[PDB]
Curated annotation (Swiss-Prot), chains A, B, C, D, E, F:
Chain positions found as Phosphoserine: S4
Extracellular side: 44-75, 138-168
Disease in which the protein is involved: Oculodentodigital dysplasia: A disease characterized by a typical facial appearance and variable involvement of the eyes, dentition, and fingers. Characteristic facial features include a narrow, pinched nose with hypoplastic alae nasi, prominent columella and thin anteverted nares together with a narrow nasal bridge, and prominent epicanthic folds giving the impression of hypertelorism. The teeth are usually small and carious. Typical eye findings include microphthalmia and microcornea. Oculodentodigital dysplasia, autosomal recessive: A disease characterized by a typical facial appearance and variable involvement of the eyes, dentition, and fingers. Characteristic facial features include a narrow, pinched nose with hypoplastic alae nasi, prominent columella and thin anteverted nares together with a narrow nasal bridge, and prominent epicanthic folds giving the impression of hypertelorism. The teeth are usually small and carious. Typical eye findings include microphthalmia and microcornea.
Subunit structure: A connexon is composed of a hexamer of connexins. Interacts (via C-terminus) with TJP1. Interacts (via C-terminus) with SRC (via SH3 domain). Interacts (not ubiquitinated) with UBQLN4 (via UBA domain). Interacts with SGSM3 and CNST. Interacts with RIC1/CIP150. Interacts with CSNK1D. Interacts with NOV. Interacts with TMEM65. Interacts with ANK3/ANKG and PKP2.
Protein name: Gap junction alpha-1 protein
Disulfide bonds: C53-C153, C148-C159
Compartments it resides in: Cell membrane; Cell junction, Gap junction; Endoplasmic reticulum
Major site of localization recorded for this protein: membrane
Segments traversing the membrane: 23-43, 76-96, 117-137, 169-189
Result, substituting S85Y: In ODDD; de novo mutation found in a sporadic case
Keywords on record: Acetylation, Cataract, Cell junction, Cell membrane, Disease variant, Disulfide bond, Endoplasmic reticulum, Gap junction, Hypotrichosis, Isopeptide bond, Membrane, Palmoplantar keratoderma, Phosphoprotein, S-nitrosylation, Transmembrane, Transmembrane helix, Ubl conjugation
Known function: Gap junction protein that acts as a regulator of bladder capacity. A gap junction consists of a cluster of closely packed pairs of transmembrane channels, the connexons, through which materials of low MW diffuse from one cell to a neighboring cell. May play a critical role in the physiology of hearing by participating in the recycling of potassium to the cochlear endolymph. Negative regulator of bladder functional capacity: acts by enhancing intercellular electrical and chemical transmission, thus sensitizing bladder muscles to cholinergic neural stimuli and causing them to contract.
Part of the intact protein present: 2 to 235 of 382
Length: 196, 196, 196, 196, 196, 196
């Protein structure tokens, strides 16, 4: 899918934060969006067609794949990218506000820094909430054999995944870049409070 | 499919409403169009190929899938996006009218607010009508086993769906964002009547 | 396929007709082109692969599908979109004519309204001709079981379609929007004759 | 495939011919390029996968399809579009020549009309040559049953095509528009000789 | 794949050579890039899926297809297009050099023609080297039956190709246009030496 | 996937290095990005579907393909392209710094060369690290028969690859262009130290 409407919105705010926000937007663009667009999404091209179970009961493959993957990793990461960008847009809702009021002055320690720090803490608690949800549901490593225990299958079946290693490497990689994007917010908030 | 012709039309009206209409257009662009373009549409890539029924009678799969899904959710949401945007375009039909009449004045509590509020109530009754149609037809949760009762199949068959959980999460998500877009119109109409 | 060469041609004439021609071009862009581009075309993605007949004679599926669908609905609608736009282009052939003659005057109840009304009646008779052809060939509702009576199959076979309801809804929808685009030409011609 | 490099070249010459060349370029853009881009090419999406022969000898399908279709119609039409556009480009090779010589004059019944008419007769003899090649090889109607007489198959086999009618309609349509583009060159050359 | 980065580089040098280099770039754009982009690449869409061998030994199809096609023709032509364009870029490395030195003069029979002729002879020897490699490996005509003599297959097998004629026509066509692009360099070098 | 966000970043720094950095960016654009975009990626279109093993045990194909390819070559090259470009961006972080400080001077042997050489040595050690990882894991030649020794398969199986030669040629080609991009950094650092 295209990423063009949010591109002009993230482009419109570029010279109102410090260097940390600029390199945070840089690692958001390069290491998250581009890497998902080229290599990451193509790896999950066949998640269901290459799935295979060792049985003959009809429909056991569907329910066992549904139990094994309640949601794919790539759509989870897409929702994570969406939910951590929109805290910054209200910052623009400050700017096009106050310039207009300066425009009103053209005719005839404020809330800016407060809106800034509340937006930053919102995006950080969103980041840590998504990391906690992923820790609770999936873990951080896919084995190559799953054991399925669902109706209408008989007693216990075992199903073999598709590429359990190439997914593991990218899971670890997205974990590391999310941790660095977590730490940078801590650095910037400490810098602003030190300049506070 | 591309979304470019309506993009310039929704871009052409941006500074004639309040902040509520602006953030309504924001959640229309981001949470509806982009999310449908990237992650939502790819989930329904195999609705029929991964469908499977437990029988041998030829053609029972076609009629049972037709009965189970009279219309897909993604095309329903596309029609919902189309039908709730066109009430605003007549607002532009006011503006390019009256500026031309001001242009005519260049040569030689009116109907604006009324057209505004009638357009807003039209888009809200369209929204609630589509929510009621979806409540009546589908419900809000897909089970993993369907029971089919149609000719030319024999007595009763049962067919297993494809990903009954990953669709359920996005159904709930589109429900929530439609409810918020419903409530925002109420907020803006009360604000205009309070300033009325 | 792309729609870009005719886009600049339909964009080049925008301020030489009344409001009826403008909203006619609006419903031409939104409700015909965009809806075909996003949702309508994807529904007919598998017209032949999901087709299925109840026999063993080799090649009966090909001839029975050929008899059932002499031409698909989506390509018929594409030809209908093409044939009803080109009557307006000759209007541009007037304008870039006469401005050049006004350009010639820069150096050293006419045929405009007549060309206008002949173009409008041509596009309306094209519209009603295509509606009559579709009424004669297909009807307006697809059943879910077809009976095929062609060589080299044996006596009579029956073949099951693919999604007979989701196609029916869009057939009815294109019928309604074609009827409204038919009525608007009547409104505009009566308005011009009343101002005649 | 994209059509963008030749687009700027056909756009660069637009105001150096009469109205006949302009409407010839118009029917070249609309009725040839767009119709091939949207509807025509998608009809030949499965020419080989839907092909089917009534035998068991391995590889008979490949040689019988190769004998039945030495070249597809759509690539033939693509080559026809390419070969009839390049006679006009040398006209540009006149213009950017002589303006430069007029540029040289800025510093310190000719060959134009002759190059024009030789380019037009070249494009017309190319058009009639391609029509004659298509008449000689294919004819103008595809039957629904082919009889194949090639090694390594046994004595005689018969193979069933894919959509013999929807291809026939577009074959007839491309024939008609090629005939009109043939006649327009005759009209323009007679007009220039009458003004000669 | 896209061709956009080298497009601006080939566009940036357009008015520093004679008419022969201009029409050479013209036949490079039209007859090589566009024809590969639209019709040529789609013909080789199924090179392996439509391949078929007459045996039951598992894996014989893979090794026999590997022996029959060490590299496909379309990727060979892509490498040929890449390797014969980069001799011209150093010409730009002259121009943006010397203009800068003229820029230096703004502040406070040379090597141009030599770099020109060395670039032209490099691109011609690259062209003839690629023609010789294609003559040595493949020949210029694909038969319709291949005989395979590789382990782990038994004694001798025979495999049937996919479309042996439609590939032959384009092989001959690319041969002819490569020969014309070979001859044009000879014409231009003789013209420069005659003006030398 | 698209490559557009990093394109403007690599375009924004073009006139702050010597000719070696310019031709290094040239071979980065042409021989790495374009060649991956057109021909290289299409060769690995069917890495798993054309994979084939000589057994009947269910799921042995999945684990044997997973052991044979822990990560594909094309995604490895994508990560290599990403990791060797970002050392240069900090150079921009110098420039938009110091110009702003010159902008500050507008109102009222330094660290530039040091940041330059540290960025260049970082990108070279990244290049040699990726070459060493590829040497350690894969080698530089793919055989056509693999021997698999993993549970749940029985004792030893053998699996046949897909196109072992067309991949070998591009492996060797990427090796050569990576070696040249390695040597050019050595040339430029020696040139700067000689001018040091």
């Amino acid at each position: 899918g295209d990423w063009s409407a949010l591109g002009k919105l993230l482009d419109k705010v570029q010279a109102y934060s410090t260097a940390g926000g600029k390199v945070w937007l840089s690692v958001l663009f390069i290491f998250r969006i581009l890497l998902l667009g080229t290599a990451v999404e193509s790896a999950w091209g066949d998640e269901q067609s290459a799935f295979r179970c060792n049985t003959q009961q009809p429909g056991c493959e569907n329910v066992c794949y549904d139990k094994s993957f309640p949601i794919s990793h790539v759509r989870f990461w897409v929702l994570q990218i969406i939910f951590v960008s929109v805290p910054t847009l209200l910052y623009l809702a400050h700017v096009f506000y106050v310039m207009r009021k300066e425009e009103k002055l053209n005719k005839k320690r404020g809330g800016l820094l407060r809106t800034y720090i509340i937006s930053i803490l919102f995006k950080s608690i969103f980041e840590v909430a998504f990391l906690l949800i992923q820790w609770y549901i999936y873990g951080f490593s896919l084995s190559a054999v799953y054991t399925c225990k669902r109706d209408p299958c008989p007693h216990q079946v075992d199903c073999f995944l598709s590429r359990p290693t190439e997914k593991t490497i990218f899971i670890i990689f997205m974990l590391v870049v999310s941790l660095v994007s977590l730490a940078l917010n801590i650095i910037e908030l400490f810098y602003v409070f030190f300049k506070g």
